[PDB]
Design an enzyme around this catalytic site. Structure first.
Site, PDB file in Angstrom:
ATOM      1  N   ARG A  53       0.830  -0.994   0.038  1.00 38.19           N
ATOM      2  CA  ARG A  53       0.106  -0.038  -0.034  1.00 38.19           C
ATOM      3  C   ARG A  53       0.558   1.187   0.001  1.00 38.19           C
ATOM      4  NH1 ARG A  53      -3.632   2.205   4.902  1.00 38.19           N
ATOM      5  NH2 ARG A  53      -4.043   4.334   4.210  1.00 38.19           N
ATOM      6  N   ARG A  62      -7.712  18.663   6.888  1.00 42.78           N
ATOM      7  CA  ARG A  62      -6.481  18.609   7.711  1.00 42.78           C
ATOM      8  C   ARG A  62      -6.238  19.555   8.299  1.00 42.78           C
ATOM      9  NH1 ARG A  62      -4.573  12.684   6.660  1.00 42.78           N
ATOM     10  NH2 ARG A  62      -3.001  12.239   8.625  1.00 42.78           N
ATOM     11  N   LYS A  84     -13.419   2.433  -1.006  1.00 43.04           N
ATOM     12  CA  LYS A  84     -13.353   2.581   0.400  1.00 43.04           C
ATOM     13  C   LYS A  84     -14.647   3.504   0.902  1.00 43.04           C
ATOM     14  CE  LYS A  84      -9.266   4.844   1.206  1.00 43.04           C
ATOM     15  NZ  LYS A  84      -8.048   5.145   2.190  1.00 43.04           N
ATOM     16  N   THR A  88      -7.909  -0.695   8.920  1.00 46.85           N
ATOM     17  CA  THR A  88      -7.690   0.275  10.292  1.00 46.85           C
ATOM     18  C   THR A  88      -7.786  -0.529  11.621  1.00 46.85           C
ATOM     19  OG1 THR A  88      -8.512   1.677   8.569  1.00 46.85           O
ATOM     20  CG2 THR A  88      -8.540   2.709  11.065  1.00 46.85           C
TER      21      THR A  88
HETATM   22  K     K Z   1      -5.420   8.088   1.940  1.00 48.75           K
HETATM   23 MN    MN Z   2      -9.689   7.809   5.652  1.00 54.35          MN
END
Ligand code: K
Ligand code: MN
Length: 514
Positions: free
Chosen positions: A61, A108, A253, A311
């Site tokens: 990844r 962010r 995702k 995760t």
């Molecule tokens: K990402």
């Molecule tokens: Mn995420």
């Protein structure tokens, strides 16, 4: 005392299958579930890389929410160098896939002053690019320019893995005054989460547009796209990819609610899926996470599309060698859940015990893979596809069934397109699937599929199909024996084509191991 938890496999009721599990019943040599590892500073090194491979890594990844193209490419070179390092031994060369991780709508934070804790007291958010250098406990800068149009007065805001909860109290064109519900030490460059507020940030951003196209140039095998809510969003990534990236897989995702809410559409358009727990957790009430996990996984199993579970599967292991009792139940259940791939993000990038992480993902996966109730499972799965009268579907079904009866050592599927093998893994057999392709992308991507153990043919195409076929078969044969999947007179099912340009593996056989 049996092996592969076969005494449990015999039970009439689920309760009895559970009742029958044995700590002293040995799993098999092979591993079916794939392991996706996220590379970072702790595992970028070719030496570190190879051992990782040898441990069990299948897919590499690349988290693009952080990183320069320069850094990513180095990561890549390396992955292939350690990869092609083993390539001189055909029988012991493990193909490895490479995946890109996009950074879709992603708020962010700013930066903190070079000199940051917060109490149950007040703070204030700013979008003006001046406090971005100095992000004191008193002032913060968000990445999202349209923040004051999304959130309302009373609306909560999360940051640093929802760890820090901020209640809204006031607004301004260039501000938001917020109280601290749940606050602690605020870091530098932490991501925010706006649960119950509508992000109007594009699915595919210039950077993502940039990032994607670059994927195309790097020959990545699959793309993990973040924040998918619609199917139109899936389309967009396909478009951005275009003809060049025709052969790349798009794994959506799910990270929001809308995502779970609009899953069928997403599923269709997708080529795979990922349960992005890290974000959904923040997004939906965490007590509700398992529900969206099983729905997802079950639905993807019924459909035939690969699914990933990620995760915090083994967090604790980031700083500590041994996982926790819950880290281990999470990973084991995830395999039982029927996820086709598990994944490490922190444990293999930042991580202090990278390898020890992969190792236990592998050990847990083997044990959980046999705990499966393969009989019910296949009946439960046969029933669903009952609507389909595919030919390969039929042939896959047969092969799996017959592998239960004669307790095969493995299934050997000679594909190119990799469809035929895909089709059989879909039927959750209990034995390894040895797919033999001359196509590389195909092998690398086959990891996405549970059960599949790709091998690649470097040998030229021979005149007689019969001999070419016997050429490939043999290899499978040879590679299983070495890896130790099966011995000298074991039984194994083989799926091939009658004649070239067959389109699908329509010939089945029951051939003992030489
Ligand atoms: K990402
Ligand atoms: Mn995420």
């Amino acid at each position: 005392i049996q092996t592969q938890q076969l005494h449990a496999a015999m039970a009439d009721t689920f309760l009895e299958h559970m009742c029958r599990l044995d700590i002293d019943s040995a799993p098999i040599t092979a591993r079916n579930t794939g392991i996706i590892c996220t590379i970072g500073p702790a595992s970028r090194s070719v030496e570190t890389l190879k051992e990782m491979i040898k441990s069990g890594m299948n897919v590499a990844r690349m988290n693009f929410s952080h990183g320069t193209h320069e850094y990513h490419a180095e990561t890549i070179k390396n992955v292939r160098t350690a990869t092609e390092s083993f390539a001189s031994d055909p029988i012991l060369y493990r193909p490895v896939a490479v995946a890109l991780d996009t950074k879709g709508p992603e708020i962010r934070t700013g930066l903190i002053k070079g000199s940051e804790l917060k109490k149950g007291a007040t703070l204030k958010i700013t979008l003006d690019n001046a406090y971005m250098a100095a992000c004191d406990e008193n002032i913060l800068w968000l990445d999202y320019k349209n923040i004051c149009k999304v959130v309302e007065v009373g609306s909560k805001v999360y940051v640093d893995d929802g760890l820090i909860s901020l209640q809204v109290k006031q607004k301004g064109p260039d501000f938001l005054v917020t109280e601290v519900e749940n606050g602690g030490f605020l870091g530098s460059k932490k991501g925010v989460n706006l649960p119950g507020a509508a992000v109007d940030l594009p699915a595919v951003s210039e950077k993502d547009i940039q990032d994607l196209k670059f994927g195309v140039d790097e020959d990545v095998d699959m793309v993990f796209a973040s924040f998918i809510r619609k199917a139109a969003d899936v389309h967009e990534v396909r478009k951005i990819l275009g003809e060049k990236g025709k052969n790349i897989k798009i794994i959506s995702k799910i990270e929001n609610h809308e995502g779970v809410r609009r899953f069928d559409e997403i599923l269709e358009a997708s080529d795979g899926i990922m349960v992005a727990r890290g974000d959904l957790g923040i997004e939906i009430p965490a007590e509700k996470v398992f529900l969206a996990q099983k729905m997802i996984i079950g639905r993807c199993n019924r459909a035939g599309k690969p699914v990933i579970c990620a995760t915090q599967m083994l967090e604790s292991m980031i700083k500590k060698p041994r996982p926790t009792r819950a880290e281990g139940s999470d990973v084991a259940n995830a395999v039982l859940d029927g996820a086709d791939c598990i994944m490490l993000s922190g444990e293999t990038a930042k991580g202090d015990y990278p390898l020890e992480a992969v190792r236990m993902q592998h050990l847990i996966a083997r044990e959980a893979e046999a705990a499966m109730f393969h009989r019910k499972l296949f009946e439960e799965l046969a029933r669903s596809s009952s609507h389909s009268t595919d030919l390969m579907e039929a042939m896959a079904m047969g092969s799996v069934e017959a592998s239960y009866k004669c307790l095969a050592a493995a299934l050997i599927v000679l594909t190119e397109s990799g469809r035929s093998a895909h089709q059989v893994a879909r039927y959750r057999p209990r034995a390894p699937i040895i797919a033999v392709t001359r196509n590389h992308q195909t092998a690398r991507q086959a990891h996405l599929y549970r059960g599949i153990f790709p091998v690649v043919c470097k040998d030229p195409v021979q005149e007689a199909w019969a001999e070419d076929v016997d050429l490939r078969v043999n290899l499978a044969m040879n590679v299983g024996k070495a890896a130790g999947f099966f011995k000298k007179g074991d039984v194994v099912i083989v799926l091939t084509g009658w004649r070239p340009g067959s389109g699908f593996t329509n010939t089945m056989r029951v051939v003992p191991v030489p």
